[PDB]
Amino acid sequence: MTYIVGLTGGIGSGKTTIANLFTDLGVPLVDADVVAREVVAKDSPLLSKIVEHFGAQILNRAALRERVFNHDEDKLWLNNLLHPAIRERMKQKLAEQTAPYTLFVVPLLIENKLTALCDRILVVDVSPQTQLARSANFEQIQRIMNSQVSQQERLKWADDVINNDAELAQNLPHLQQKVLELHQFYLQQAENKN
Numbered sequence: 001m002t003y004i005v006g007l008t009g010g011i012g013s014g015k016t017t018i019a020n021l022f023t024d025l026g027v028p029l030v031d032a033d034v035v036a037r038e039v040v041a042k043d044s045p046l047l048s049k050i051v052e053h054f055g056a057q058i059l060n061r062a063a064l065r066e067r068v069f070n071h072d073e074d075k076l077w078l079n080n081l082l083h084p085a086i087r088e089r090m091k092q093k094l095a096e097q098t099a100p101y102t103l104f105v106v107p108l109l110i111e112n113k114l115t116a117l118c119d120r121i122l123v124v125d126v127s128p129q130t131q132l133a134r135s136a137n138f139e140q141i142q143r144i145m146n147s148q149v150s151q152q153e154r155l156k157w158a159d160d161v162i163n164n165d166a167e168l169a170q171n172l173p174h175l176q177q178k179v180l181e182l183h184q185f186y187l188q189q190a191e192n193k194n
Protein backbone atom coordinates (compact mmCIF):
# COMPACT_ATOMS: atom_id res chain seq x y z
CA MET A 1 0.00 0.00 0.00
CA THR A 2 1.05 3.56 -0.54
CA TYR A 3 2.01 5.18 2.75
CA ILE A 4 -1.04 7.37 3.55
CA VAL A 5 -0.83 10.80 5.12
CA GLY A 6 -4.20 12.12 6.36
CA LEU A 7 -4.20 15.95 6.11
CA THR A 8 -6.80 17.84 8.10
CA GLY A 9 -7.48 21.11 9.85
CA GLY A 10 -10.39 23.29 10.92
CA ILE A 11 -12.41 25.46 8.60
CA GLY A 12 -10.27 28.16 7.03
CA SER A 13 -6.98 26.75 8.33
CA GLY A 14 -5.35 26.19 4.91
CA LYS A 15 -5.88 22.52 4.08
CA THR A 16 -6.17 23.29 0.33
CA THR A 17 -3.15 25.56 0.35
CA ILE A 18 -0.96 22.94 1.98
CA ALA A 19 -2.37 20.03 -0.11
CA ASN A 20 -1.38 22.08 -3.17
CA LEU A 21 2.27 22.33 -2.07
CA PHE A 22 2.39 18.52 -1.85
CA THR A 23 0.73 17.99 -5.25
CA ASP A 24 3.32 20.47 -6.62
CA LEU A 25 5.89 17.78 -5.70
CA GLY A 26 4.02 15.21 -7.85
CA VAL A 27 2.45 13.48 -4.83
CA PRO A 28 -1.01 12.05 -5.49
CA LEU A 29 -4.03 13.30 -3.66
CA VAL A 30 -7.24 11.68 -2.61
CA ASP A 31 -9.58 14.46 -1.66
CA ALA A 32 -12.66 13.69 0.48
CA ASP A 33 -14.82 16.43 -1.03
CA VAL A 34 -14.07 15.18 -4.54
CA VAL A 35 -14.96 11.59 -3.58
CA ALA A 36 -18.17 12.74 -1.89
CA ARG A 37 -18.85 14.26 -5.29
CA GLU A 38 -18.16 11.18 -7.36
CA VAL A 39 -20.47 9.15 -5.15
CA VAL A 40 -23.62 10.99 -6.27
CA ALA A 41 -22.58 11.71 -9.83
CA LYS A 42 -25.25 11.89 -12.59
CA ASP A 43 -25.74 8.26 -13.38
CA SER A 44 -24.97 6.72 -10.04
CA PRO A 45 -26.92 4.21 -7.93
CA LEU A 46 -26.64 6.36 -4.84
CA LEU A 47 -28.06 9.40 -6.66
CA SER A 48 -31.07 7.51 -7.85
CA LYS A 49 -31.87 6.38 -4.27
CA ILE A 50 -31.57 9.94 -2.98
CA VAL A 51 -33.98 11.03 -5.70
CA GLU A 52 -36.47 8.30 -4.71
CA HIS A 53 -36.39 9.45 -1.11
CA PHE A 54 -36.52 13.22 -1.64
CA GLY A 55 -38.04 13.80 -5.07
CA ALA A 56 -36.64 15.02 -8.40
CA GLN A 57 -37.24 18.35 -6.72
CA ILE A 58 -33.56 17.90 -5.78
CA LEU A 59 -28.17 16.67 -8.46
CA ASN A 60 -28.99 20.19 -7.26
CA ARG A 61 -26.53 20.14 -4.38
CA ALA A 62 -27.76 23.41 -2.90
CA ALA A 63 -31.33 22.15 -2.99
CA LEU A 64 -30.30 18.92 -1.25
CA ARG A 65 -28.20 20.79 1.37
CA GLU A 66 -31.14 23.03 1.87
CA ARG A 67 -33.36 20.00 2.47
CA VAL A 68 -30.99 18.43 4.96
CA PHE A 69 -31.04 21.58 7.11
CA ASN A 70 -34.67 20.88 8.12
CA HIS A 71 -33.86 18.69 11.13
CA ASP A 72 -31.31 16.06 12.03
CA GLU A 73 -33.77 13.57 10.56
CA ASP A 74 -33.27 13.67 6.79
CA LYS A 75 -29.57 14.43 7.46
CA LEU A 76 -29.40 11.16 9.41
CA TRP A 77 -30.95 9.33 6.50
CA LEU A 78 -28.55 10.81 4.00
CA ASN A 79 -25.50 10.24 6.20
CA ASN A 80 -26.62 6.60 6.74
CA LEU A 81 -26.57 6.23 2.99
CA LEU A 82 -23.54 8.28 1.89
CA HIS A 83 -20.95 8.12 4.74
CA PRO A 84 -20.28 4.37 4.34
CA ALA A 85 -20.25 4.78 0.59
CA ILE A 86 -17.78 7.67 0.71
CA ARG A 87 -15.54 5.77 3.08
CA GLU A 88 -15.41 2.76 0.78
CA ARG A 89 -14.67 4.84 -2.30
CA MET A 90 -11.83 6.54 -0.32
CA LYS A 91 -10.33 3.19 0.58
CA GLN A 92 -10.52 2.14 -3.11
CA LYS A 93 -8.76 5.26 -4.37
CA LEU A 94 -6.04 4.98 -1.72
CA ALA A 95 -5.37 1.29 -2.52
CA GLU A 96 -5.11 2.17 -6.23
CA GLN A 97 -2.18 4.54 -5.65
CA THR A 98 1.26 3.33 -6.55
CA ALA A 99 3.37 6.33 -5.46
CA PRO A 100 5.40 5.77 -2.32
CA TYR A 101 3.05 8.02 -0.36
CA THR A 102 -0.34 9.62 -0.87
CA LEU A 103 -1.89 12.66 0.74
CA PHE A 104 -5.45 11.99 1.91
CA VAL A 105 -7.16 15.32 2.48
CA VAL A 106 -10.15 15.10 4.80
CA PRO A 107 -11.85 18.09 6.43
CA LEU A 108 -13.59 15.83 8.95
CA LEU A 109 -10.88 13.25 9.36
CA ILE A 110 -11.27 13.18 13.14
CA GLU A 111 -14.92 14.00 13.50
CA ASN A 112 -16.07 11.26 11.07
CA LYS A 113 -13.63 8.79 12.51
CA LEU A 114 -11.64 8.18 9.28
CA THR A 115 -8.26 8.15 11.13
CA ALA A 116 -8.02 4.36 10.79
CA LEU A 117 -7.62 4.84 6.99
CA CYS A 118 -4.31 6.70 7.16
CA ASP A 119 -0.83 5.94 8.54
CA ARG A 120 -0.11 9.29 10.05
CA ILE A 121 -1.89 12.60 10.55
CA LEU A 122 -0.77 15.95 9.29
CA VAL A 123 -2.56 18.96 10.77
CA VAL A 124 -2.52 22.47 9.45
CA ASP A 125 -2.82 24.52 12.58
CA VAL A 126 -3.98 28.12 13.03
CA SER A 127 -5.72 30.04 15.82
CA PRO A 128 -9.51 30.37 15.91
CA GLN A 129 -9.13 34.08 15.17
CA THR A 130 -7.19 33.11 12.05
CA GLN A 131 -9.88 30.60 11.03
CA LEU A 132 -12.47 33.44 11.22
CA ALA A 133 -10.24 35.92 9.36
CA ARG A 134 -9.29 33.59 6.57
CA SER A 135 -12.82 32.30 6.17
CA ALA A 136 -14.07 35.82 5.49
CA ASN A 137 -20.85 35.15 7.99
CA PHE A 138 -18.75 35.56 11.08
CA GLU A 139 -21.79 33.99 12.74
CA GLN A 140 -22.04 31.09 10.28
CA ILE A 141 -18.24 30.22 10.52
CA GLN A 142 -18.37 30.22 14.27
CA ARG A 143 -21.10 27.57 14.31
CA ILE A 144 -19.05 25.50 11.90
CA MET A 145 -16.11 25.87 14.24
CA ASN A 146 -18.34 24.90 17.14
CA SER A 147 -19.14 21.56 15.50
CA GLN A 148 -15.54 20.72 14.67
CA VAL A 149 -12.93 19.48 17.15
CA SER A 150 -11.02 22.07 19.19
CA GLN A 151 -7.53 23.25 18.31
CA GLN A 152 -6.16 21.33 21.28
CA GLU A 153 -7.94 18.15 20.39
CA ARG A 154 -6.81 18.31 16.70
CA LEU A 155 -3.27 18.94 17.88
CA LYS A 156 -3.24 15.91 20.23
CA TRP A 157 -4.29 13.78 17.26
CA ALA A 158 -1.51 15.16 14.98
CA ASP A 159 1.70 13.31 14.18
CA ASP A 160 2.95 16.29 12.22
CA VAL A 161 1.97 19.94 12.46
CA ILE A 162 2.54 22.82 10.07
CA ASN A 163 1.45 26.24 11.44
CA ASN A 164 -0.35 28.58 8.97
CA ASP A 165 -1.12 31.55 11.10
CA ALA A 166 1.38 33.98 9.46
CA GLU A 167 0.42 35.62 6.13
CA LEU A 168 1.68 33.99 2.92
CA ALA A 169 3.51 37.12 1.80
CA GLN A 170 6.12 36.64 4.54
CA ASN A 171 5.86 32.98 5.43
CA LEU A 172 5.38 31.11 2.17
CA PRO A 173 9.04 30.22 1.75
CA HIS A 174 9.15 28.73 5.29
CA LEU A 175 5.92 26.86 4.56
CA GLN A 176 7.51 25.45 1.42
CA GLN A 177 10.55 24.41 3.33
CA LYS A 178 8.52 22.60 5.96
CA VAL A 179 6.60 20.75 3.23
CA LEU A 180 9.93 19.72 1.56
CA GLU A 181 11.13 18.45 4.93
CA LEU A 182 7.92 16.48 5.48
CA HIS A 183 8.12 15.24 1.86
CA GLN A 184 11.54 13.83 2.53
CA PHE A 185 10.33 12.30 5.79
CA TYR A 186 7.30 10.68 4.21
CA LEU A 187 9.38 9.08 1.50
CA GLN A 188 11.59 7.65 4.24
CA GLN A 189 8.51 6.37 6.07
CA ALA A 190 7.32 4.72 2.89
CA GLU A 191 10.74 3.06 2.35
CA ASN A 192 10.72 1.77 5.96
CA LYS A 193 7.45 -0.08 5.18
CA ASN A 194 9.64 -2.20 2.88
Ligand SMILES: Nc1ncnc2c1ncn2[C@@H]1O[C@H](COP(=O)(O)OP(=O)(O)OP(=O)(O)O)[C@@H](O)[C@H]1O
Pocket residue numbers: 009010011012013014015016017018107134135164165166167168169
Ligand atom coordinates in the same frame (compact mmCIF):
# COMPACT_ATOMS: atom_id res chain seq x y z
N1 LIG B 1 -1.13 31.77 5.17
C1 LIG B 1 -1.96 32.38 4.36
N2 LIG B 1 -2.02 33.74 4.35
C2 LIG B 1 -3.07 34.44 3.82
N3 LIG B 1 -4.11 33.74 3.30
C3 LIG B 1 -4.05 32.37 3.31
C4 LIG B 1 -3.00 31.65 3.83
N4 LIG B 1 -3.21 30.34 3.74
C5 LIG B 1 -4.41 30.20 3.11
N5 LIG B 1 -4.92 31.46 2.88
C6 LIG B 1 -6.22 31.85 2.29
O1 LIG B 1 -7.20 31.59 3.27
C7 LIG B 1 -8.34 30.94 2.76
C8 LIG B 1 -8.48 29.52 3.32
O2 LIG B 1 -7.38 28.76 2.87
P1 LIG B 1 -7.62 27.30 2.28
O3 LIG B 1 -8.67 27.13 1.25
O4 LIG B 1 -6.28 26.79 1.93
O5 LIG B 1 -8.21 26.56 3.58
P2 LIG B 1 -9.10 25.25 3.72
O6 LIG B 1 -8.82 24.74 5.08
O7 LIG B 1 -8.89 24.26 2.60
O8 LIG B 1 -10.46 26.04 3.67
P3 LIG B 1 -11.93 25.49 3.95
O9 LIG B 1 -11.96 24.15 4.71
O10 LIG B 1 -12.57 26.47 4.85
O11 LIG B 1 -12.56 25.47 2.56
C9 LIG B 1 -8.14 30.93 1.25
O12 LIG B 1 -8.73 32.12 0.81
C10 LIG B 1 -6.64 31.00 1.10
O13 LIG B 1 -6.20 31.59 -0.11
Ligand SMILES: [Hg+2]
Pocket residue numbers: 006115116117118119120121
Ligand atom coordinates in the same frame (compact mmCIF):
# COMPACT_ATOMS: atom_id res chain seq x y z
HG1 LIG C 1 -4.09 8.21 10.50
